[PDB]
Every structure is written in structure tokens, then in C-alpha cells.
């Protein structure tokens, strides 16, 4: 009874009835763009290494 | 006269080598340009 009454009191102190307009979307978006930059560079490095192997292969 | 054919052999050899080097160089140029463009737009 003590714990649940205390937590209903604490929830009464920090309730607002408003849907919390904060977010973390933009940072996730920028992190996704950074990772796709890295992936693009990886594919291009694979292609350059493959042409180098074709040149050295003969 | 055979040394002329030797010259033609090595000429064809490094013709192919130079064209492959041009492809490697073009891909490096394009990767550098893409990296600089994509990193320039992030700000």
C-alpha cells in the first residue's frame, strides 16, 4: 500500500495530459546518412581493388 | 628487325597497362569527388 500510494502521488506530480513533443529523429537520420556514405565508399573501394587485381593479374 | 617486334610487343603491353591505370585513376577521382560533395553538404 505504501509503495503504490507513493507512486500514485509521484505520478500525480509529473502528469500533464500532453503528448510530449520532443523526439530524436534528426540525429538518427544523420547517422543513417553517415553510414550510407561509408557503405558507398566501401562498394567503390571494392571496385577499384577489383580493377587493380585485373591489371596485376596479367 | 626482331627488336622492332620486341618494341611493338612492349608497346602493346604498356598500352593495355596504361588503359587499366586510367580506369583505376578515374574511379579514384570519382570516389574523391563523391566523398567531398557528400561531406560538403552535411553542414
Swiss-Prot record, chain A:
Protein name as annotated: Mediator of RNA polymerase II transcription subunit 11
Major location (coarse): nucleus
Protein's job: Component of the Mediator complex, a coactivator involved in the regulated transcription of nearly all RNA polymerase II-dependent genes. Mediator functions as a bridge to convey information from gene-specific regulatory proteins to the basal RNA polymerase II transcription machinery. Mediator is recruited to promoters by direct interactions with regulatory proteins and serves as a scaffold for theee assembly of a functional pre-initiation complex with RNA polymerase II and the general transcription factors.
Gene source species: Homo sapiens
GO terms for cellular component: core mediator complex; mediator complex; nucleoplasm; nucleus; ubiquitin ligase complex
Family: Belongs to the Mediator complex subunit 11 family.
Keywords linked to the UniProt accession: Acetylation, Activator, Disease variant, Epilepsy, Neurodegeneration, Nucleus, Transcription, Transcription regulation
Subcellular compartments: Nucleus
UniProt record, GO biological process: positive regulation of transcription elongation by RNA polymerase II; positive regulation of transcription initiation by RNA polymerase II; protein ubiquitination; RNA polymerase II preinitiation complex assembly
GO function terms (MF aspect): transcription coregulator activity; ubiquitin protein ligase activity
UniProtKB/Swiss-Prot annotation, chain B:
UniProt feature coiled coil, ranges: 1-38
Free-text tissue specificity from the UniProt record: Expressed in brain, heart, kidney, liver, lung, pancreas, placenta and skeletal muscle.
Highest taxon, organism lineage: Eukaryota
Compartments (UniProt record): Nucleus
Record-stated family: Belongs to the Mediator complex subunit 30 family.
Subunit organization: Component of the Mediator complex, which is composed of MED1, MED4, MED6, MED7, MED8, MED9, MED10, MED11, MED12, MED13, MED13L, MED14, MED15, MED16, MED17, MED18, MED19, MED20, MED21, MED22, MED23, MED24, MED25, MED26, MED27, MED29, MED30, MED31, CCNC, CDK8 and CDC2L6/CDK11. The MED12, MED13, CCNC and CDK8 subunits form a distinct module termed the CDK8 module. Mediator containing the CDK8 module is less active than Mediator lacking this module in supporting transcriptional activation.
Summary of the function given for this chain in its UniProt record: Component of the Mediator complex, a coactivator involved in the regulated transcription of nearly all RNA polymerase II-dependent genes. Mediator functions as a bridge to convey information from gene-specific regulatory proteins to the basal RNA polymerase II transcription machinery. Mediator is recruited to promoters by direct interactions with regulatory proteins and serves as a scaffold for the assembly of a functional preinitiation complex with RNA polymerase II and the general transcription factors.
Name of the protein in its database record: Mediator of RNA polymerase II transcription subunit 30
Organism of this sequence: Homo sapiens
Parent sequence residues shown: 136 to 178 of 178
Amino acid at each position: 500500500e505504501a509503495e503504490l500510494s507513493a507512486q500514485i502521488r509521484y505520478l500525480t506530480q509529473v502528469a500533464t495530459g500532453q503528448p510530449h513533443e520532443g523526439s530524436s529523429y534528426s540525429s538518427r537520420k544523420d547517422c543513417q546518412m553517415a553510414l550510407k556514405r561509408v557503405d558507398y565508399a566501401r562498394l567503390k573501394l571494392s571496385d577499384v581493388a577489383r580493377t587493380c587485381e585485373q591489371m596485376l593479374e596479367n | 628487325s626482331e627488336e622492332r617486334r620486341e618494341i611493338a610487343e612492349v608497346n602493346k603491353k604498356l598500352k593495355q597497362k596504361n588503359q587499366q591505370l586510367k580506369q583505376i585513376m578515374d574511379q579514384l577521382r570519382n570516389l574523391i569527388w563523391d566523398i567531398n560533395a557528400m561531406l560538403a553538404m552535411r553542414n
